[PDB]
Design an enzyme around this catalytic site. Structure first.
Site, mmCIF file in Angstrom:
data_model
loop_
_atom_site.group_PDB
_atom_site.id
_atom_site.type_symbol
_atom_site.label_atom_id
_atom_site.label_comp_id
_atom_site.label_asym_id
_atom_site.label_seq_id
_atom_site.Cartn_x
_atom_site.Cartn_y
_atom_site.Cartn_z
ATOM 1 C CB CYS A 167 88.460 66.303 21.476
ATOM 2 S SG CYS A 167 90.185 65.515 21.924
ATOM 3 C CB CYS A 227 88.170 68.120 25.945
ATOM 4 S SG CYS A 227 86.971 67.085 25.004
ATOM 5 C CE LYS A 263 87.053 71.696 29.260
ATOM 6 N NZ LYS A 263 85.369 71.087 29.096
ATOM 7 C CE1 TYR A 321 78.612 69.896 26.818
ATOM 8 C CE2 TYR A 321 80.949 70.366 27.321
ATOM 9 C CZ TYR A 321 79.880 69.753 26.514
ATOM 10 O OH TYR A 321 80.157 69.302 25.433
ATOM 11 C CD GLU A 379 83.583 73.012 30.394
ATOM 12 O OE1 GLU A 379 83.639 73.157 29.157
ATOM 13 O OE2 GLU A 379 83.293 71.876 31.097
ATOM 14 C CD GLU A 381 88.414 61.338 54.084
ATOM 15 O OE1 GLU A 381 88.513 60.093 54.926
ATOM 16 O OE2 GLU A 381 89.207 62.200 54.152
HETATM 17 C C1 LIG Z 1 84.261 73.859 24.091
HETATM 18 C C2 LIG Z 1 83.938 72.290 24.273
HETATM 19 C C3 LIG Z 1 84.368 71.654 25.218
HETATM 20 C C4 LIG Z 1 84.289 70.290 25.287
HETATM 21 N N1 LIG Z 1 84.555 69.609 26.470
HETATM 22 C C5 LIG Z 1 84.621 68.315 26.578
HETATM 23 C C6 LIG Z 1 85.006 67.501 27.877
HETATM 24 O O1 LIG Z 1 85.451 68.089 28.825
HETATM 25 N N2 LIG Z 1 84.817 66.259 28.010
HETATM 26 C C7 LIG Z 1 84.482 65.453 26.833
HETATM 27 O O2 LIG Z 1 84.442 64.131 26.845
HETATM 28 N N3 LIG Z 1 84.063 66.326 25.746
HETATM 29 C C8 LIG Z 1 84.178 67.590 25.674
HETATM 30 N N4 LIG Z 1 83.686 68.098 24.446
HETATM 31 C C9 LIG Z 1 82.815 67.513 23.322
HETATM 32 C C10 LIG Z 1 83.875 66.653 22.354
HETATM 33 O O3 LIG Z 1 84.957 67.254 21.956
HETATM 34 C C11 LIG Z 1 83.185 65.923 21.359
HETATM 35 O O4 LIG Z 1 82.219 65.043 21.828
HETATM 36 C C12 LIG Z 1 84.195 65.034 20.617
HETATM 37 O O5 LIG Z 1 85.093 65.706 19.806
HETATM 38 C C13 LIG Z 1 83.403 64.173 19.697
HETATM 39 O O6 LIG Z 1 84.376 63.782 18.454
HETATM 40 P P1 LIG Z 1 83.838 63.486 17.272
HETATM 41 O O7 LIG Z 1 84.596 62.548 16.265
HETATM 42 O O8 LIG Z 1 82.383 62.624 16.956
HETATM 43 O O9 LIG Z 1 83.604 64.681 16.572
HETATM 44 P P2 LIG Z 1 84.942 65.731 16.396
HETATM 45 O O10 LIG Z 1 86.108 65.574 17.407
HETATM 46 O O11 LIG Z 1 84.323 67.296 16.301
HETATM 47 O O12 LIG Z 1 85.584 65.345 14.886
HETATM 48 C C14 LIG Z 1 84.760 65.429 13.696
HETATM 49 C C15 LIG Z 1 85.745 66.022 12.627
HETATM 50 O O13 LIG Z 1 85.264 65.680 11.405
HETATM 51 C C16 LIG Z 1 85.567 66.782 10.553
HETATM 52 N N5 LIG Z 1 84.582 66.962 9.508
HETATM 53 C C17 LIG Z 1 83.298 67.565 9.335
HETATM 54 N N6 LIG Z 1 82.872 67.230 7.926
HETATM 55 C C18 LIG Z 1 83.589 66.613 7.234
HETATM 56 C C19 LIG Z 1 83.795 66.490 5.754
HETATM 57 N N7 LIG Z 1 82.385 66.365 5.206
HETATM 58 N N8 LIG Z 1 84.850 65.805 5.263
HETATM 59 C C20 LIG Z 1 85.885 65.426 6.341
HETATM 60 N N9 LIG Z 1 85.956 65.689 7.668
HETATM 61 C C21 LIG Z 1 84.769 66.428 8.087
HETATM 62 C C22 LIG Z 1 85.235 68.021 11.430
HETATM 63 O O14 LIG Z 1 85.949 69.229 10.868
HETATM 64 C C23 LIG Z 1 85.841 67.558 12.800
HETATM 65 O O15 LIG Z 1 87.279 67.904 12.627
HETATM 66 C C24 LIG Z 1 83.676 69.462 24.526
HETATM 67 C C25 LIG Z 1 83.428 70.137 23.067
HETATM 68 C C26 LIG Z 1 83.565 71.691 22.932
HETATM 69 C C27 LIG Z 1 83.180 72.340 21.983
HETATM 70 AU AU LIG Z 2 88.892 66.406 23.907
#
Ligand SMILES: Cc1cc2nc3c(=O)[nH]c(=O)nc-3n(C[C@H](O)[C@H](O)[C@H](O)COP(=O)(O)OP(=O)(O)OC[C@H]3O[C@@H](n4cnc5c(N)ncnc54)[C@H](O)[C@@H]3O)c2cc1C
Ligand SMILES: [Au+]
Ligand SMILES: Cc1cc2nc3c(=O)[nH]c(=O)nc-3n(C[C@H](O)[C@H](O)[C@H](O)COP(=O)(O)OP(=O)(O)OC[C@H]3O[C@@H](n4cnc5c(N)ncnc54)[C@H](O)[C@@H]3O)c2cc1C
Ligand SMILES: N[C@H](CCC(=O)N[C@@H](CS)C(=O)NCC(=O)O)C(=O)O
Ligand SMILES: N[C@H](CCC(=O)N[C@@H](CS)C(=O)NCC(=O)O)C(=O)O
Ligand SMILES: [Au+]
Ligand SMILES: [Au+]
Ligand SMILES: [Au+]
Ligand SMILES: [Au+]
Ligand SMILES: [Au+]
Ligand SMILES: [K+]
Ligand SMILES: [K+]
Lengths: 588, 588
Positions: free
Chosen positions: B149, B154, B157, B291, B295, B571
């Site tokens: 994120c 997000c 982006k 998307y 985007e 609206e």
């Molecule tokens: C280009 C792009 C645009 C997006 N735009 C939007 C948007 O406009 N609106 C929206 O709502 N969502 C958007 N998203 C999706 C959104 O970013 C994700 O749904 C969100 O990050 C989910 O969070 P999360 O905690 O589940 O995963 P993440 O935020 O990715 O967090 C997971 C973290 O855990 C870490 N990790 C992985 N394995 C290990 C390990 N074994 N040990 C320790 N750490 C580890 C990873 O490195 C990562 O930092 C977008 C995604 C992308 C790629």
């Molecule tokens: Au985000």
């Protein structure tokens, strides 16, 4: 219900067809009426629960209980066999045109409400006349069809507000990596005005075409109701004549007020003049603190103007006062000056407006503060935004019997009926109603539907959402904090709030904790949202969706269990947790 | 209910105080716990209906029925007299720190969900560890704390999307009377990137400070669950160690996919690399139609880029396909090229990326169309956006017993519980759930509240609103038209729709009838709004408020009786009348 509804429907509708969706005889009439281009209301009885009861009640009006039954102005004319029999001799056209009056409807006032009512009424075959006249401003400014909204209101206001916003966009663009140039850029009032007036021109013509295509008689004349069914008109050549109508909708709107002081009418302008003003206002004084005053002062400052606002007491009287203060604070931090607790005494002319050089004159403004101290400063343009008033003494004879309140507005029932039964009032002239475009539109459309299409739905005037289009926009829906506290008690009101910052402002290096939002709630009613308030960019786009939810009776919990859209400003409403009673800072 | 709820609450909460608002003995403990800085959950029993029943059930855990009763990790420790007696000998600190494990909670993954869970858990005094590690991309791109994120999702982006939007604002500004200059203006990728990365940097640090201030242990290490309560960590120096936790939240998120072809991993980039890319991509090919793909391609074109999108079949699979086509049409009419029904076979390097000159290399892209015809074209940058996958084989031993579905995502119950009872999963790795930031946040926060504060509220995953931030934004909430038709039948679905144009686009001379919105409705359920769809500017700000209304069960009538805010885009939802079955054009 059924009995009363049918009598009223039959007596009021101009052309109406009682029908069923599954009938070849009904279809034969529908195809005939469409071919002869006769517009009509259609009531599908098989689509209604009390449809079977209506058929038996229709016998009192027509002697028959079958469908289709065609009625013209309170009179049964025939069934499918008879209607097609009239169409055969080419007599049907004359029957549907037969009337006691010249029109089924006369609309006095061609603005938002009046045009909405007229166009809707014509759909169901009511012979409709729309009257519009624009009385010139002191300085002779006039405009075309469309009312205040299109010509001197919401439309030109928001366009100039957008022109003001682009000033900030030009600044932001550098930070976002665009090569410029922002200090070497200036604004041209005349380029903007002509663009805005060109769009206003197309709307002027758009309405003239719409009324024509819907077969509505448009008269560019001043109307005057002299009797319940008689309207006196005056055209461009000062010809005086009288037209008759069954139903009368008054939609004459308002015009700006002038304070009773020397120089005001002669040397000052209003919003009516600003939007087509040939010259740039320059160093400007805005007298007043209404939303008009602040919106106008707002963009004028953003268009390289030296702007002062003269405030009698408070900003945005009637609006949430905490929110009003924040609106003003932003403006004061972005160029707008304020003359607090100040009123004007006279305007002396120092220089006459240069017509052939597109430049303002010069005015000396004399006034005084509340304590007694004197105010004296030179301004190039003085704008009065001290309120708006109806002018129904010009429109309405006292003998007709249409009751007006203390402020000269028409007292109406919940279905827009005046004290004269066939006379109705909508829009800004309807007492106690929110004075906004879509309110006038909903009122007009729905009224036309009840009158000529047998509809029952009334206009809901509660919890109408607003947006003040100041440099930083303020969107509201519901009660202010002070009003909710007054109505229910301080102990029953919980206010959730939070400061925030648009993501777009981060790279652009704009001030933190300027955007503010709150939810005013009633604790004993499952934390019911009584009022929503948002200060930020696109506050109108933000507030709109919520107005539907508040209408349905939204609680704080309903906001909480909804998921936010990231990244947006609006999503902040889904996660509010800091209350005012906790005393914790609303900052992020 | 009461019996089951209390056992679960006591056994799961780390530090919890059962209390009443009107008690001087309860206040004495609260003031002591605040003074000793011991964070805890508070259950005010006089604020609950079954509060009297709970007191009698508390006797099974504590022998007493009075308040306050303090519990530490499933064990009664004492009443007000005893707690203050422990605080007197300075023994209380050791009692509340007494644990069977190192932590009450281990969060594996420091992203949106993981940070939301960790911070919330700490509020109620749970000893919390948050693990985050960012595995380098093929080309070695790494970033700080915050997840996808903040760093590669997000945030960057939408900021680059805003930079793209300002291109249009620069064009509009002339029409609105600003002197420029628009053809003599260019964009600098490096200025923008550094601004965006500077804001990303402050968020990286913001989270590190937040975890510290909330007394959450942050470890920059790679976690691996080897047993239900054991997590193996690996730090920067490759030191391998084991930490124990009572509850485990898996929040490891996803990473971009690579197609199994030669050259892809070596010569192509993903979204992970684009947002910190030192050089401007230049002539760019985006492989994929998600998307993310659209985007990214969207703003790159708006930043003076030669952009081609290679589409295997359809755009935005899973989204409304009519809406998806309109999103693509706009992009195609504003620079974006499309290679339809095309897949890549290999990428050959023609030129190596010039590090010391901030320029891209050159790549030859070989592919084929569906018919069999060959694709061959030169691109400076190839971006893969062919999907995103969890990598839980690296995170999760097969022996632990956490069940994964066909796509490698964790199968969860409706309270985020894995097949191992103390192990939970949130965010993108939670099977079948919308993959969005606020979903991960709500999930994490609410889970933490249930675990350590005795809350019962589950996360609602239905009707989660989305916004695709393409050049023209697309906001949706609910079912697509094809899905609603499939689920209920064509005869039961009514679709109200209308084209519109922003007021801001009138003076700016932009295309009429590009912005489109629709309401998908169920006829037999009082015209219930099943899906809302809007294509236009600020579509996210527009959709948000409505998501609350849809949650409440909004009908078409609820939209109709709400009054619009003029002038706004939103609206238009309040006055929809044209249905798809009528066949009348949606144009205005
Ligand atoms: C280009 C792009 C645009 C997006 N735009 C939007 C948007 O406009 N609106 C929206 O709502 N969502 C958007 N998203 C999706 C959104 O970013 C994700 O749904 C969100 O990050 C989910 O969070 P999360 O905690 O589940 O995963 P993440 O935020 O990715 O967090 C997971 C973290 O855990 C870490 N990790 C992985 N394995 C290990 C390990 N074994 N040990 C320790 N750490 C580890 C990873 O490195 C990562 O930092 C977008 C995604 C992308 C790629
Ligand atoms: Au985000
Ligand atoms: C500066 C400004 C900004 C505004 N901004 C907003 C906004 O952002 N949002 C919003 O919702 N509202 C806004 N409004 C208010 C909105 O314009 C009005 O509420 C709306 O115009 C009401 O429409 P109406 O039909 O009742 O009156 P009008 O639109 O004013 O129409 C009345 C018409 O009747 C004509 N008339 C008067 N007497 C006669 C006569 N006797 N014979 C024939 N014709 C006659 C008048 O000349 C006028 O054209 C704004 C108003 C102003 C002044
Ligand atoms: N009444 C005849 C024919 C129409 C007719 O047979 N009426 C039918 C329409 S299918 C009807 O209303 N049936 C009685 C009912 O619906 O109760 C006419 O209009 O000339
Ligand atoms: N039990 C004593 C004093 C606390 C006490 O008297 N308990 C009261 C709190 S006001 C109580 O819960 N009353 C019984 C009830 O509420 O039913 C202690 O904690 O040392
Ligand atoms: Au208007
Ligand atoms: Au005013
Ligand atoms: Au904001
Ligand atoms: Au993707
Ligand atoms: Au729009
Ligand atoms: K005043
Ligand atoms: K694909």
């Amino acid at each position: 219900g059924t009995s009363q509804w049918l009598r009223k429907t039959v007596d009021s509708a101009a052309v109406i067809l009682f029908s069923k969706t599954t009938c070849p005889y009904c279809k034969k009439v529908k195809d005939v009426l469409a071919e002869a281009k006769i517009k009509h209301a259609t009531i599908e009885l098989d689509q209604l629960s009390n449809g079977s009861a209506i058929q038996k009640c229709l016998a009192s009006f027509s002697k028959i209980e079958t469908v289709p039954q065609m009625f013209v102005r309170g009179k049964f004319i025939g069934d499918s066999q008879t209607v097609l029999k009239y169409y055969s001799n080419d007599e049907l056209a004359g029957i549907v045109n037969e009337s006691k009056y010249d029109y089924d409807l006369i609309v006095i006032g061609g603005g938002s409400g009046g045009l909405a009512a007229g166009k809707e009424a014509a759909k169901y075959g009511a012979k409709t006349a729309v009257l519009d006249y624009v009385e010139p401003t002191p300085i002779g400014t006039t405009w075309g069809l469309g009312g205040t909204c299109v010509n001197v209101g919401c439309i030109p206001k928001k366009l100039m507000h957008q022109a003001g916003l682009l000033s900030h966009a030009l600044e932001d663009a550098e930070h976002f990596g665009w090569s410029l140039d922002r200090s070497k850029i200036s604004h041209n009032w005349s380029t903007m005005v002509e663009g805005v007036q060109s769009h206003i021109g197309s709307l002027n013509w758009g309405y003239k075409v719409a009324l024509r295509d819907n077969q509505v008689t448009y008269l560019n004349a001043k109307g005057r109701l002299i009797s319940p069914h008689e309207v006196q008109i005056t055209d461009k050549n000062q010809k005086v004549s009288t037209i008759t109508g069954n139903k009368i909708i008054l939609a004459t709107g308002e015009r700006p007020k002038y304070p009773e002081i020397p120089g005001a009418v002669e040397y000052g302008i209003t919003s009516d003049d600003l939007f087509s003003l040939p010259y740039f206002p320059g160093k400007t004084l805005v007298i007043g603190a209404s939303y008009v005053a602040l919106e106008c002062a707002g963009f004028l400052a953003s268009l390289g103007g030296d702007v002062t606002v003269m405030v009698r007491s408070i900003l945005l009287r009637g609006f949430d006062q905490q929110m009003a203060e924040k609106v003003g604070d932003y403006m004061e931090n972005h160029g707008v000056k304020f003359a607090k607790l100040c009123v004007p005494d006279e305007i002396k002319q120092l220089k006459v407006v240069d017509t052939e050089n597109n430049k303002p004159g010069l005015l000396l403004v004399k006034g005084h503060y509340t304590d007694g101290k004197k105010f004296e400063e030179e301004f190039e343009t003085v704008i009065f935004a001290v309120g708006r008033e109806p002018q129904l003494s010009k429109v309405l004879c006292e003998t007709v019997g249409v009751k007006l309140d203390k402020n000269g507005r028409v007292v109406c029932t919940d279905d827009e009926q005046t004290t004269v039964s066939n006379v109705y009032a909508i829009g800004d002239i309807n007492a106690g109603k929110p004075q906004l475009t879509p309110v006038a539109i909903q009122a007009g459309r729905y009224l036309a539907r009840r009158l000529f299409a047998g509809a029952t739905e009334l206009t809901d005037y509660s919890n109408v959402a607003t947006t003040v289009f100041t440099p930083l926009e303020y969107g509201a829906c519901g009660l202010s904090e002070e009003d909710a506290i007054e109505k229910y008690g301080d102990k029953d009101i919980e206010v959730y709030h939070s400061n925030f910052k648009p993501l777009e402002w981060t790279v652009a290096h704009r001030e933190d904790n300027v955007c503010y939002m709150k939810l005013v709630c009633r604790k004993s009613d499952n934390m019911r949202v009584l009022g929503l308030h948002v200060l930020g960019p696109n506050a109108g786009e933000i507030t709109q969706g919520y107005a539907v939810a508040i209408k349905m009776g939204a609680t704080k919990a309903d906001f909480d269990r909804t998921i936010g859209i990231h990244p947006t400003c609006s999503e902040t409403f889904t996660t509010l947790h800091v209350t005012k009673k906790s005393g914790v800072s609303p900052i992020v």
